[PDB]
Amino acid sequence: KILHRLLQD
Amino acid sequence: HKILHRLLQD
Amino acid sequence: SLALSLTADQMVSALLDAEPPILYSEYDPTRPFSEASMMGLLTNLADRELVHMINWAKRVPGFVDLTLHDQVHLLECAWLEILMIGLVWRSMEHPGKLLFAPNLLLDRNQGKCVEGMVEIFDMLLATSSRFRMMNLQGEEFVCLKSIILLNSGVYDHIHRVLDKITDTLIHLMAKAGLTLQQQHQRLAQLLLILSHIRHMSNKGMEHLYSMKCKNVVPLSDLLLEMLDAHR
Amino acid sequence: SLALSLTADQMVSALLDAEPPILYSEYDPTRPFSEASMMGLLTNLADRELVHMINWAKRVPGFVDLTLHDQVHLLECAWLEILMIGLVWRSMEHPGKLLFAPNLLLDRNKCVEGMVEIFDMLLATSSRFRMMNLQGEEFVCLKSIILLNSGVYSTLKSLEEKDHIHRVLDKITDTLIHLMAKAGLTLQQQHQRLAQLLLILSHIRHMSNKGMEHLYSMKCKNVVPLSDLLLEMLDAHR
Ligand SMILES: CC(C)Cn1nc(-c2ccc(O)cc2O)c2cccc(C(F)(F)F)c21
Numbered sequence: 001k002i003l004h005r006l007l008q009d
Numbered sequence: 010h011k012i013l014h015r016l017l018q019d
Numbered sequence: 020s021l022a023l024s025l026t027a028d029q030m031v032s033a034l035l036d037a038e039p040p041i042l043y044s045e046y047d048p049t050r051p052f053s054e055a056s057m058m059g060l061l062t063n064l065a066d067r068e069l070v071h072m073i074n075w076a077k078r079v080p081g082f083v084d085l086t087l088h089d090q091v092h093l094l095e096c097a098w099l100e101i102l103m104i105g106l107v108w109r110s111m112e113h114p115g116k117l118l119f120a121p122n123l124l125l126d127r128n129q130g131k132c133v134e135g136m137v138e139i140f141d142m143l144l145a146t147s148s149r150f151r152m153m154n155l156q157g158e159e160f161v162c163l164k165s166i167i168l169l170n171s172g173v174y175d176h177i178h179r180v181l182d183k184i185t186d187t188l189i190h191l192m193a194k195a196g197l198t199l200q201q202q203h204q205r206l207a208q209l210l211l212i213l214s215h216i217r218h219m220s221n222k223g224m225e226h227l228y229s230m231k232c233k234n235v236v237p238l239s240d241l242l243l244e245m246l247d248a249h250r
Numbered sequence: 251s252l253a254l255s256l257t258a259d260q261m262v263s264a265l266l267d268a269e270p271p272i273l274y275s276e277y278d279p280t281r282p283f284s285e286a287s288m289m290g291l292l293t294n295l296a297d298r299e300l301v302h303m304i305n306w307a308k309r310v311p312g313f314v315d316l317t318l319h320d321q322v323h324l325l326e327c328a329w330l331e332i333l334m335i336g337l338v339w340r341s342m343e344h345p346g347k348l349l350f351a352p353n354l355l356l357d358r359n360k361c362v363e364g365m366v367e368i369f370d371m372l373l374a375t376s377s378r379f380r381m382m383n384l385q386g387e388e389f390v391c392l393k394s395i396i397l398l399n400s401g402v403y404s405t406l407k408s409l410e411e412k413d414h415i416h417r418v419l420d421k422i423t424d425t426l427i428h429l430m431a432k433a434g435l436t437l438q439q440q441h442q443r444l445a446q447l448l449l450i451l452s453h454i455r456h457m458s459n460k461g462m463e464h465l466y467s468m469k470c471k472n473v474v475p476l477s478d479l480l481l482e483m484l485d486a487h488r
């Protein structure tokens with residue numbers, strides 16, 4: 001999940 | 010002509 | 020425009036007296052679990068409520084000052100929102116349930132039998148719960164409903180009337196003993212819910228359209244013309 | 251939870267500080283565009299803005315206190331509304347035009363079919379901001395409200411997170427009223443302005459919903475390029 005990953009970064 | 014147009018008239 | 024010369028109490032009285040009645044569904048003992056039976060009952064209900072909504076709108080201060088075309092535009096834009104806010108209002112005392120009519124209480128278990136409906140049901144239920152937890156008052160409700168009528172299609176008279184309704188909402192909260200701080204916080208909370216009501220209307224409108232396509236349930240000419248306006 | 255303990259002025263400076271940058275489009279006057287190419291400019295632009303929106307969101311007080319799943323939900327729900335209010339804000343001083351990017355300023359004249367009405371709606375919204383003389387301090391508050399509000403409606407957990415969002419929302423309301431009071435508005439003018447501002451979010455939700463509908467339409471027509479992220483965002487609404 002792209003958004004999920006970006007949020008974690 | 011719309012039904013609405015008619016209903017909105019007294 | 021008479022609207023602007025009303026006191027807060029007069030505005031509230033006007034709005035209370037304009038209230039449309041609470042309508043009943045067909046009196047069959049059958050709980051709908053099918054797309055056909057549920058849509059049958061909801062469209063007939065909406066059909067009959069629309070006629071009352073129209074004559075209610077005419078009694079909203081400031082509304083009748085608009086040209087006929089503008090009146091048409093506002094109702095075409097707002098009608099489902101208006102039906103929905105009424106729905107969640109009367110559903111307040113029935114947690115977990117949607118009271119489309121006194122003889123038509125639906126739970127999410129029935130909405131989950133119609134494709135892509137359970138989502139909107141859950142949103143309606145959450146909005147109802149929200150109104151319940153806020154102790155929403157009938158006088159506040161009618162202000163909110165009128166705000167929807169005037170705001171949703173509004174794209175100077177309308178703006179001034181809308182300001183007047185805001186004054187009226189504040190008046191009511193002040194009359195209920197709320198502090199100035201609680202007043203502006205409560206105003207914000209109520210107004211933010213209008214965005215959710217708008218969201219639910221739009222998703223609902225898409226649903227109505229798919230029914231017009233999928234057919235099966237005949238739609239009134241009025242409903243068709245309303246739907247057609249959102250397209 | 252920091253946010254709860256920020257003063258109104260602290261809240262505002264925090265929000266101002268977190269403002270995302272204004273990105274450029276790939277518009278080129280010497281290059282021909284189709285209706286689809288034109289839209290490609292906007293989807294491409296939107297895709298790039300999303301990464302910055304994610305960073306901005308983390309700097310909105312209270313947001314980082316949320317679970318990761320709740321954060322993604324809010325952004326999935328609110329992203330287009332947030333792009334749109336940003337658009338409307340930077341377009342204020344361009345009557346009759348929308349400033350998608352500094353190198354992409356458009357009047358209503360390659361809008362497909364029905365897209366034009368959304369365009370008119372954004373125009374209307376912008377001129378609405380212009381007539382109110384919307385202030386940046388107000389703008390950033392409104393934008394933070396969209397983020398927290400547009401997706402808020404089992405466990406709790408769940409219920410517990412909701413209340414915290416509500417608390418943050420009350421805070422931003424206090425901040426708005428504080429800004430207005432400082433600006434010299436009477437109490438009546440404060441409540442009215444607050445209401446005028448919040449009712450505009452209804453129209454912004456509406457424009458967002460219509461936009462999403464067209465976005466799904468473009469995916470199906472499969473001509474205008476949509477990023478993998480925009481696709482995923484789109485799926486969330488469906
Ligand atoms: C999720 C649905 C209950 C929304 N809805 N609500 C209603 C509805 C009917 C009466 C009322 O008082 C309030 C309503 O929301 C409705 C009516 C016709 C069609 C629909 C449809 F599903 F297509 F969106 C209606």
Ligand SMILES: CC(C)Cn1nc(-c2ccc(O)cc2O)c2cccc(C(F)(F)F)c21
Pocket residue numbers: 292293295296299333334336337350365368369372460461462464465
């Ligand atoms: C102006 C309209 C093209 C609406 N719009 N605006 C934007 C948009 C893009 C960037 C931005 O900063 C602000 C925007 O409103 C947009 C993006 C993707 C899709 C659409 C769509 F047409 F489908 F609704 C978008």
